[PDB]
Structure 1
């Protein structure tokens, strides 16, 4: 799972955001197609950052206290 899985998730998130922007209820349309779109955007951005920092790490977990029964 290289960088392009982030792009794929971006694609599906963008599809959802455009779809909802089209289908936002008319009663509170601005509130809907602002709050839902911004939640999708920020949730995706934070997830992508969390995934990317782990994608090609420059630091690996390092500890001395791991109990040997968990080596499986």
Structure 2
């Protein structure tokens, strides 16, 4: 689970570093598109990583 927190640190620090270094021309759509898309990419990565970190169902097939 700590390799989810370790990715949350480098995503959150990147989003904070982009909040202060956004271009001044279109600030409320530079720091709103890029910071929210990193949040949603990290959310789907964390959900697709934690479902396989400690699984309850093993993959079972016959034809191999």
Encode CA deviations 1:16-57: one digit per residue, 9 max, x unaligned. Answer: 000000100000010000000000000000000000000000
Asked which structure has the greater CA Rg, the reply is 1
Instruction: Give the aligned CA root-mean-square deviation in angstroms.
Output: 0.4
Aligned to 1:50: 48
Normalized against structure 2, the TM-score is what?
Answer: 0.98
User: Across the two proteins, how many residue pairs are aligned to each other?
Assistant: 64
Structure 1 residue ranges without an equivalent (≥5): 67-72
Q: Distance in 2 between matches of 1:11 and 1:55?
A: 19
Q: Distance in 2 between matches of 1:26 and 1:55?
A: 41
Structure 2 residue ranges without an equivalent (≥5): none
Q: Distance in 2 between matches of 1:18 and 1:40?
A: 11
- How far the C-alpha of 1:59 sits from its partner, in A, is 0.4
Normalized against structure 1, the TM-score is what?
Answer: 0.88
